[PDB]
Structures are given as C-alpha cells and as structure tokens.
C-alpha cells in the first residue's frame with residue numbers, strides 16, 4: 001500500500017463565548033433509520049466518520065432524503081468566520097481545455113482533530129427503546145460553514161508545485177472543479193492531464209464532461225462563448241417578484257446581447273417589498289419587453305481574450321439616461337457587451353453620465369482582463385476639453401478617441417465668465433408666502449424693461465427660478481442676469497441639460513437658444529439697487 | 539529583537555476589508571515583491587482560518603522605477619488601540635514648521651527588523667488578487683512590523699531614539715520628527731550643507747523630498763484696487779465682503795451697496811463716493827488683522843477643503859470649526875499633470891496632508907470636489923505617499939470658489 005501524501009488540517013475554533021452545539025434528534029421512520037445506519041456503516045469503513053459515546057455532550061440533528069442530510073445550522077452559527085465567478089470573456093483562447101471535478105471533495109480532506117468532537121450527530125433507534133447511535137466526522141462535512149474554504153485552500157496547496165513545474169499549461173481553480181488550458185498538442189495535453197490527476201492522486205484526490213460546457217449559466221464552446229437560453233415568461237397578469245425575475249434575467253442577458261433595456265420595467269419596482277401585485281405596462285414598457293424579445297430572437301456569441309491585441313470599449317447613448325457598451329478586440333467580434341443607467345438625481349447632463357459609464361467599464365475591465373480598454377466615445381475632443389476645463393469638479397477619462405455615431409454627446413449651453421458689453425442687464429427676483437403659497441416673480445432692467453408675474457401654489461425657490469426664466473424669455477440673444485438666489489445659481493452652475501423639474505427644463509431650453517448669457521450673483525437684502533425684493537413682496 | 543504585546547480597542551474585531559481590483563502589472567509587482575519578502579521571513583502565507591483582510595496595491599515613488607508595496611491600513615489604524623507610551627504622548631515639535639528647511643526620508647526598511655507580536659499578526663492579513671478571479675488570491679500576514687500601520691512607529695520609537703541619540707547630541711539645532719514610515723528633519727542650513735548633512739544622517743542610519751516650510755506662510759483676504767469700478771466689480775466686492783463678514787467682525791457693506799442703487803448695466807463705471815472709499819479702507823484695515831480666537835484643538839478632527847481654480851491652480855483651507863481657518867493655501871505646482879485633473883488633485887491632497895503632518899502632527903479629513911466614482915477609480919495611480927488620509931465628496935458647487943482667488 002503506497003501511502004497517500006498527508007494533508008495538514010486547518011485549525012478551527014468556535015466563536016468566543018460559545019460551546020459546541022446541543023440539539024435534540026427528530027423522530028425518523030424505520031426506513032430512514034435503517035438507511036442511515038447502512039450509510040454510516042460503510043462511511044465508517046471508509047474512515048470518513050467514527051463512533052463516539054456519552055463523553056460528547058454535543059449533538060447535531062440528522063434527516064434522510066437514500067441520502068444522509070446533516071443539519072449544521074446551529075454549528076454554522078457557532079463556527080468561527082472563514083475567509084465572484086470568472087467571466088468567460090476574460091478566459092484566454094487555448095488549443096485544449098480540460099475540466100476535472102474532484103470526486104468526494106470534502107470527504108477527501110481531513111477535519112481538524114480537535115474540532116471533530118463538535119460535529120457529532122445521533123441516529124435514532126427503533127421505537128426509541130435504545131440509546132441512539134453516536135457518530136462524529138473525521139473529514140469536512142457537507143453543509144459545514146468552513147468546508148469550502150478549507151477544501152479550496154487545501155486544493156491550492158496541493159496544486160501549487162505542479163503549476164510551477166508546468167508553466168506551459170494554465171490551471172484555473174474555481175470551487176470543486178479544475179479547468180486546465182494549454183496551447184500544446186492534444187497528445188502532450190492529455191499526457192499532462194494524466195500527470196496532473198496522478199499528482200492529485202498522490203494526495204488522494206480522485207478525478208474522472210466535454211465541450212460545449214454548461215457552466216454557471218454560460219455556454220462555453222471551443223472558439224466562442226454565450227449565455228444559456230433565457231426564458232421570459234409571457235403573462236397577461238404580472239407581479240412584483242415576477243418583474244424581479246424578469247429584470248434579473250434581462251440583466252443577465254445584457255452581457256452578451258446588445259441593446260437590452262431594463263428601465264421601464266424597473267420604474268415599476270419603486271415602493272416595492274410586496275410579493276404579489278398586478279401592474280400595467282406603459283406602451284414604452286410593452287415595446288421595451290417586445291424589443292427585448294426581438295433582440296433575443298436570434299443567438300449572439302462572444303469570443304475569448306487575446307492578450308496580444310488591444311482592448312477596446314465603445315459606448316452609445318441609448319436615451320433617457322440609458323447607455324450601452326461593447327468591449328471587443330477585432331471589429332464585429334465582441335468580448336462582451338453591457339449597459340449603464342444614470343444615477344438617481346434631480347438634475348443631470350450627458351457628459352457626466354458618459355463619464356460615470358466610463359468609470360464602470362474601467363472597473364469591470366480591470367476585474368476581467370486586468371487592464372483599462374481604449375475607449376471610443378460619441379463626443380468630440382473639443383467638447384470634452386471645454387467641459388473638463390470649465391467644470392468646477394475634477395474629472396478624467398482614460399485614453400479615448402472620438403467615434404462619430406449619433407446621437408453625439410454635446411454641451412448645450414455655456415455661461416460667460418465675464419459680464420457682456422452691450423447686453424441688457426436683467427435684475428431678477430422672486431418670493432413667496434409660506435402660508436398661502438402665493439408669490440411673485442419678475443425683473444427690472446437698465447433700459448427700463450420691467451415685469452412682475454403673480455403666481456399661485458408656489459415656493460420661494462420656484463419663484464426664484466421663475467424670475468430667471470422670465471428674464472430669459474424677454475431678452476435678446478445676449479443677456480446679463482443678476483440674481484440673489486443661491487439655489488438657482490447652484491442649479492445652473494451644475495450645468496444640467498435635463499431635469500425632473502419642468503421649470504428648470506424650460507430654463508435650459510431658453511439657455512440653448514441664447515448666444516451669450518452671463519449669470520451674476522449678489523447677496524440679498526443689502527440695499528443693492530435694481531434687485532427689488534419689494535416689487536415681489538407685495 | 540523582543541516582541542511587545544499589542545491588542546485592539548475594546549469591543550473591536552480585526553479589519554475585514556474588500557480588496558479592490560488591481561491591474562495586471564501591479565499584481566505582478568506585488569507577487570514578485572511578496573515572494574521576496576516571504577523568502578526574507580517578513581511575511582508568511584496563511585490559511586482560510588484567518589477571516590481578516592486589509593487592502594493592498596502598488597505604487598512608484600519619486601525618481602524611482604521600482605514598484606513599492608502600499609498597504610492601506612486606515613481601518614486597522616482606527617481599530618488599533620490608541621497608542622500611548624512611556625513617552626507620555628510626545629508633543630509635536632512646533633519648531634519643525636518654523637524651520638528654514640525640512641527633509642523627508644523613508645525609514646520603512648528599519649521596521650522589518652523588529653518582529654510583530656504573534657497574537658496580533660492575524661490582523662495584518664492581506665490578499666494579492668487574481669485577474670478575473672481565475673484562481674484564489676494569495677494570502678499573507680506580517681511576521682515583522684508592517685509599513686503603514688500606526689503601531690509600528692510607536693513600537694519602534696525607543697529603538698529610533700537609541701539610534702538618533704548621537705545625532706541629536708552632536709548638533710542639537712536639528713529638529714527631528716517621525717510620522718509613520720517617514721522621518722522629517724528640520725534645519726536652518728544651506729541646501730548644499732543640508733544635502734550633505736542628509737547623506738550623513740542616512741548613512742548614519744545605514745550602519746545601524748526637500749520641503750521649505752519657511753517659504754510656506756499664511757495668506758490674507760485681499761480686495762481689488764481699482765481706479766474705476768463697474769457695477770459688476772462692486773457687486774463682486776460686496777459679495778466677497780459679505781462673505782468675509784462671517785470671518786471678520788466689523789465688515790460693513792452698506793455704503794458700497796449704496797452705490798449699486800438704481801438699475802444700471804453691469805459694465806457701467808460707477809465712481810466711488812467718499813463714504814464708500816472710507817468704508818472700503820476700513821474693511822482693508824479689518825482684513826489686515828488676524829482672526830479672533832483661533833486655536834488648535836488636538837481632540838478635534840482637522841478638515842481640509844479644496845477648490846479647483848482652473849489652469850492648474852487649486853486653493854485649500856484647513857480648519858476645525860467653520861470660518862476659523864488654521865491654514866490656507868494655493869497649489870499652482872505643475873509637474874506632468876497638465877491634462878489630468880485627478881492627478882493634480884491627488885498631488886494637492888498629498889501636499890496638504892504632508893504640511894498637515896508637519897504642522898499639527900496628524901492628517902486631516904478631506905472634502906474633495908470630485909465625484910466618488912471618479913476618484914475611487916483613479917486615485918491609486920497617482921499616489922506616491924506611504925500614508926493615506928480620510929476623505930469625502932462634495933457634489934454641490936461652492937459659491938466661495940472665486941472668493942478664494
């Protein structure tokens with residue numbers, strides 16, 4: 001008998017202030033009992049468990065479904081704390097790839113001997129007329145908190161020397177499986193696979209699927225990858241949870257499939273946490289899911305990664321805070337695709353969203369390929385220059401080039417840095433009464449132009465915006481506007497091209513039509529002339 | 539050669555912090571470095587029974603193409619017991635900031651001599667990540683004293699005193715301060731004599747960044763001096779004075795605001811009345827005085843605000859309570875940063891943190907004029923410092939921007 005190489009156990013402790021679990025044993029049928037005895041006998045013969053006695057106060061419950069089901073839930077609570085799936089698009093193209101699933105994974109790894117006593121369980125005897133049979137685990141149990149971690153670390157320790165000795169092959173370790181790629185010849189490859197599993201056999205790990213592999217919701221073929229078929233349920237009556245499932249599946253589909261839109265279906269999920277409900281879809285949402293079905297009509301595939309070629313990311317504006325992207329090496333062959341939705345906010349602009357999307361793609365790419373891709377962006381170099389140079393916040397985009405594929409991200413308006421000569425000066429103000437919600441908004445100018453509009457159901461901030469809006473309406477192509485509102489100045493200096501407030505939107509629409517606009521601020525109630533709080537206080 | 543027992547603060551478990559994604563080259567550098575440190579016994583591989591993790595990445599220091607290993611110890615540092623010693627909380631050498639020149643040296647290599655308390659080692663655990671999660675990350679822990687941890691200089695304080703004892707009794711006029719892995723040395727000497735003395739000291743360390751705090755002073759609030767004033771000029775002036783009236787007691791804008799009477803075009807010149815000129819003058823006199831009752835509270839957090847002024851110019855204010863300024867400054871420095879905002883900001887944050895270390899002996903909490911996602915993505919690329927400060931993000935544009943330019 002050639003001795004199998006010893007696997008050093010991992011020291012395990014419970015949480016401080018706790019002693020090993022004590023829980024009773026539920027009544028089981030004679031069938032289940034006999035089955036469990038049958039299993040435990042040969043398990044003891046194999047050395048996976050050992051018989052114990054009254055000296056062990058600790059007990060965990062066990063059922064049978066034959067398959068022995070051990071419940072470690074309380075031990076899981078009592079066990080200490082122990083220390084992302086690989087994306088197919090990141091996997092490098094290899095001439096040969098072999099999958100190996102270790103047989104009896106956890107049972108091939110010895111448990112810490114001092115921790116074994118806490119793994120105890122009791123098989124109830126027939127008619128409860130005798131003390132139930134006592135057992136404990138000598139190896140890593142199924143359902144234990146610390147089994148996957150210990151098993152994985154053990155596997156790594158065992159695998160390490162073989163990898164260094166075989167640099168011409170590459171080994172990936174996920175959970176219970178190994179995936180070995182190589183560019184060698186199929187003969188040499190198979191040979192090194194046999195060598196690998198023999199090397200594993202030295203430590204007593206048993207190894208036996210052929211392409212295409214169905215793995216973690218993916219289909220991995222030799223030259224390409226895609227996802228597994230997506231099932232979108234057709235229902236005339238939907239629910240909340242169903243929209244959760246739907247949005248989940250669509251998000252999953254959007255990695256390979258371009259053009260997936262989850263927004264309209266996502267808007268229905270605000271104010272959720274109710275499992276059941278019936279919600280209608282807007283024509284926007286109906287046509288959204290329909291267009292999604294149209295995209296899912298025919299299969300799309302991604303390719304694998306080649307380190308010798310550049311990594312390229314291209315972004316399109318999809319409209320309504322939606323952005324889509326493709327990551328690829330050579331034209332028309334995508335590594336993968338994706339999407340970005342704008343953050344929740346009152347005001348926004350395209351440039352900011354594009355920036356955010358770029359950050360997202362950058363982080364994801366760094367995860368997957370370990371590098372930042374070169375970007376193709378639907379924005380002119382000059383636009384980006386003007387933007388980042390005049391923007392109050394610090395901002396940056398990694399190396400990128402302009403691709404002309406409308407709609408192009410643009411700057412819709414630009415405020416002047418200095419007062420304009422020859423332009424009419426509009427001193428604006430607005431105010432409201434908190435109790436009656438009655439207010440006024442208007443302006444007076446240097447040419448004598450004046451206006452005051454009364455308003456119902458309004459607030460100070462709304463009238464402050466309204467005043468500026470009025471100044472924009474009644475003025476020429478070049479205008480100087482003076483305001484005391486820090487709120488309005490704060491909104492406009494953020495440079496939104498879109499807002500959820502219609503008043504702000506209209507202001508933007510006015511700014512777009514202007515040649516030159518200079519927006520100046522003054523303190524309120526300082527006796528500054530032309531700024532009339534008295535006209536709007538009446 | 540003998541480990542000193544160290545624990546955490548009461549009711550605090552060791553740090554568990556997610557390791558952020560790293561680029562391939564940085565992962566390579568970290569692998570090589572950590573292998574070298576493993577062969578030197580400085581670190582050792584650990585098993586799954588260690589739940590704790592602290593982030594790690596790789597940088598490149600000034601004038602060096604060699605990758606350095608940077609651990610981010612902030613969480614461990616705040617979870618590490620507040621370190622008081624037999625030194626009784628050594629008071630900050632306030633003479634350091636008053637020095638003609640201060641040189642910063644990296645003494646971190648010395649920390650690898652002293653072994654770390656065996657019980658505490660598990661809290662120093664970190665992970666070298668793998669690309670695309672293809673393999674489990676490589677886990678280590680520090681056997682010796684790790685660089686970046688706050689307990690390291692404290693533990694090494696006695697030894698360092700024993701090492702620097704001859705130098706301090708030789709030329710007592712040289713002030714020495716120690717923060718983290720960095721050793722700051724003040725001198726009134728000449729840059730040549732300064733550099734030779736620095737080589738002398740570094741070789742003195744061997745057998746066992748040039749700063750000029752004298753050129754860094756405090757700056758006042760100044761108002762324009764014009765022969766002719768437009769309506770816009772006076773509006774801005776009034777706004778700035780109204781803002782400054784929060785800082786200074788006797789600022790009065792009424793006679794200046796009086797000039798703004800009626801509705802005039804912004805670019806129209808308004809002659810100043812005698813009363814308005816007098817008011818402006820009195821305001822200047824008020825602005826020339828220092829600020830009333832401004833003191834440094836060691837028990838309070840330092841707060842740094844930064845504004846982007848454009849054209850590579852940045853302004854900053856270090857304070858404890860609003861409108862009481864402990865320090866103010868403007869970083870215009872241009873090195874290689876011309877087209878990159880985030881790089882400029884990163885360098886600025888580093889400089890401000892350094893000056894904070896020199897003046898108060900501790901780092902402030904930054905409020906950064908940048909979106910969280912952008913900064914969090916790019917900041918580790920431009921970071922050459924061995925320490926890291928705390929920061930937050932201001933997404934509403936400040937009006938005070940042009941009041942600091």
Ligand SMILES: N#C/C=C/c1cc(Cl)cc(Oc2ccc(Cl)cc2OCCn2ccc(=O)[nH]c2=O)c1
Pocket residue numbers: 086091092093094095096097099170171172179180181182209211213214215220221222223304672
């Ligand atoms: N189940 C399961 C497998 C799952 C699985 C999971 C992972 Cl993380 C990797 C894997 O295979 C690979 C293993 C090692 C390398 Cl260097 C590349 C691979 O390329 C993958 C690309 N590829 C994929 C299949 C094929 O035939 N040829 C090929 O080059 C397989």
